[PDB]
């Protein structure tokens, strides 16, 4: 077995380096398998989001707290409820007027204390407030 003996004789990298090279090729193949996935995925409302998943077993992974929520069923089960939540959803920092015909006695904080003024915030290691509201714009 002269040919294979000579091949086994000469090698550019040691066994550990060859192991790392095989791990590199495995990472590349994983990248390619990940890229081969489709762009979007048609899902339904009522069914849980983790029903169409394509996929070291029997143990708990780092994404356990996330796959629990993915396996539990969805909350908003109909576009009716979706829009019934959206029409009540409101923005604050939106540029422009906001509806006030609900209650006349209430005044927004912007109208009450101007725009250049903010409430003093408790500044500590635990919670940080935004600084320089003048620089906050553009």
């Amino acid at each position: 077995r002269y040919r294979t003996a000579w091949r086994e004789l000469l090698h550019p990298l040691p066994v550990r380096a060859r192991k790392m090279e095989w791990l590199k090729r495995d990472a590349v193949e994983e990248n390619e398998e990940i890229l081969r996935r489709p762009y979007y995925t048609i899902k339904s409302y009522a069914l849980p989001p983790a029903v169409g998943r394509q996929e070291i077993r029997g143990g708990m992974h780092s994404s356990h707290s996330l796959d629990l929520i993915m396996r539990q069923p969805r909350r908003v089960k109909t576009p009716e409820q979706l829009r019934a939540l959206r029409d009540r959803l409101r923005f604050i920092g939106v540029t422009g007027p906001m509806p006030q015909a609900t209650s006349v006695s209430t005044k927004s904080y912007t109208d009450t204390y101007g725009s250049r003024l903010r409430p003093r915030y408790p500044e500590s290691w635990d919670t940080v407030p935004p600084h320089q509201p003048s620089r906050e714009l553009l």
Partner: protein, 104 residues
């Protein structure tokens, strides 16, 4: 390279980084007993018409008849026991890989 004493690192393990016959155990051991006149310490298996030898001391510069360059090394490949035609280890490994050890 030299990274230890001959008790642990043999002399033929210096060229362990180079690919070819050096990564195997030599057959002849002239290091014990009387010392050779040319200070050869090892000799590998005679492949066809070529046989490898490892010198001692600083590398004796010779001229490889295959590449034509002056080569300073401890490894020398003698052709058919004729010590006028020598080969550097690089040309020796390439000659074997091509299978020209019997022809060249």
């Amino acid at each position: 390279v030299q990274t230890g004493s001959p008790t642990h690192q043999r002399e033929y393990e210096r060229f362990h980084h180079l690919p070819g016959d050096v990564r195997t155990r030599p057959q002849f051991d002239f290091t014990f007993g009387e010392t050779r006149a040319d200070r050869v310490m090892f000799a590998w298996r005679k492949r066809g018409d070529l046989q490898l030898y490892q010198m001692s001391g600083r590398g004796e510069t010779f001229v490889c008849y295959r590449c034509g360059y002056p080569v300073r090394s401890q490894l020398v490949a003698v052709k058919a026991d004729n010590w006028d035609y020598r080969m550097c280890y690089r040309c020796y490994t390439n000659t074997v890989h091509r299978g020209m050890e019997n022809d060249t």
